[PDB]
């Protein structure tokens, strides 16, 4: 295999600043005919990949000339002159010099923006779910930065870990924030044996958690 090595992660980059992505090939991508067989693709969540650079340094039609490529025949660099918020996603290198053709593992670009505290909301189970014998309590933690965040559930003031499932969105292509949902799923029996349900958010924007609660009664 010609192995293309890429870091999965890159340092957060300030809007309007330069970014660079690197790719390393285990073997020279130079052909006898002079072509260097290096290609760069971007893929945004839920989208098909987009060609940016071909033959190491040629700009793909449809790619903005903020994008540029260079390399020797083994070390390659994709550069973005001025980064935009919509540039977030995963950048891939690729080769077609030798069979089998191969892709590098992709590097995720992230924008650095000003910190923002989460907006937290809590919701009790629906009548509809309770009827089915289920009781999920939902907490949204929306539009925060940076990505690092922690959530703690409490039932009648006791910390609860069991039955908690978390999911994070990808970085927003417009405001460069993150959002997170946290769901505590109990049985109706268990839900009915307690009264107070609380979701607490801890984020670098404040030493104090953001506390949202409700009481079954």
């Amino acid at each position: 295999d010609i192995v293309l090595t890429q870091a999965a992660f890159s340092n957060p980059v300030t809007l309007g600043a330069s970014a660079s992505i690197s790719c390393r090939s285990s073997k020279s991508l130079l052909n006898s005919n002079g072509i260097i067989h290096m290609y760069w693709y971007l893929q945004k969540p839920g989208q098909s990949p987009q060609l940016l650079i071909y033959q190491m340094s040629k700009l793909a039609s449809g790619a903005p000339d903020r994008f540029s490529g260079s390399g020797s025949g083994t070390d390659f660099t994709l550069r973005i002159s001025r980064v935009e918020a919509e540039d977030v996603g995963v950048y891939y290198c690729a080769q077609n010099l030798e069979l089998p053709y191969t892709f590098g593992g992709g590097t995720k670009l992230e924008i650095k923006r000003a910190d923002a505290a989460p907006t937290v909301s809590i919701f009790p189970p629906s009548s509809e779910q309770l009827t089915s014998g289920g009781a999920s309590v939902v907490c949204f933690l929306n539009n925060f930065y940076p990505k690092d965040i922690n959530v703690k559930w409490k039932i009648d003031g006791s910390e609860r870990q069991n039955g908690v499932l978390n999911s994070w969105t990808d970085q927003d292509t417009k405001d460069s924030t993150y959002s997170m949902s946290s769901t505590l799923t109990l049985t109706k029996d268990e839900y009915e044996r307690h009264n107070s349900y609380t979701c607490e958010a801890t984020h670098k924007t404040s030493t104090s958690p953001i506390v949202k609660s409700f009481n079954r009664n």
Binding site: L51, P100, E128
Partner: protein, 218 residues
């Protein structure tokens, strides 16, 4: 206008074979190579093979010998990929792409085909409304949502007011537990607008030929 139209999502049992397609338009079909790549959920890209329909010639990834075969039909400008002896390892999104010319990369892409290899049965989602309970939620804005629970396979498509409510929406990635998936979607609107101007979530689950709508009421 060059377009590559891929066939619809597949849910099939292990050990079977599936044939997925890539219909091309907007150019001379025989004149361009088409390539196929695999993308496993939360994975990168893997190259499967290229096909030249004017030939017909193919170049293939021997890691897939006996698993994948590429063919093309000139009469209907359609490329096919046949995958056999399927396993959960084959569960991926498969993409086709046109090679724009002489080692110039893929200039047009299909939207991808999701293949899910499972003995598990199709299950429609339960959609539950999320309306603020006890704790007067904010005032200037108000956040509402929908809990989408217990379906298989991915995906579902969530919208609000049939797509006309798109601002302040966050649809979260699904979590898979006990052979079923759960997702939530939040929407934030100005307080003075709800419940005055109605807010309804719409959840489509293609695999189970089901859609359910929940209006969020106080």
């Amino acid at each position: 206008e060059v377009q590559l139209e891929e066939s619809g999502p597949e849910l099939v049992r292990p050990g079977t074979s599936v044939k997925i397609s890539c219909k091309a338009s907007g150019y001379t079909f025989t004149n361009y190579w088409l390539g196929w790549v695999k993308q496993r959920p939360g994975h990168g890209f893997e190259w499967i093979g290229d096909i030249y329909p004017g030939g017909v010639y193919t170049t293939n990834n021997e890691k897939f010998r006996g698993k994948a075969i590429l063919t093309a039909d000139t009469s209907s400008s359609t490329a096919y990929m046949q995958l056999s002896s399927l396993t959960s390892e084959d569960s991926a999104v498969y993409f086709c792409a046109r090679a724009g010319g002489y080692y110039t990369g893929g200039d047009y892409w299909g939207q991808g085909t999701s293949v899910t290899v499972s003995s598990a049965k199709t299950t429609p989602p339960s959609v539950y409304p999320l309306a603020p309970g006890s704790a007067a939620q904010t005032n200037s804005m108000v956040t509402l949502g929908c809990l989408v629970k217990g379906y298989f396979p991915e995906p579902v498509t969530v919208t609000w007011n049939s797509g006309s409510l798109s601002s302040g929406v966050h649809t979260f990635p699904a979590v898979l537990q006990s052979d079923l998936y759960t997702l939530s979607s939040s929407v934030t609107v100005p307080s003075s607008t709800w419940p005055s101007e109605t807010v309804t979530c719409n959840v489509a689950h293609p695999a189970s030929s089901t859609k359910v709508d929940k209006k969020i009421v106080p």
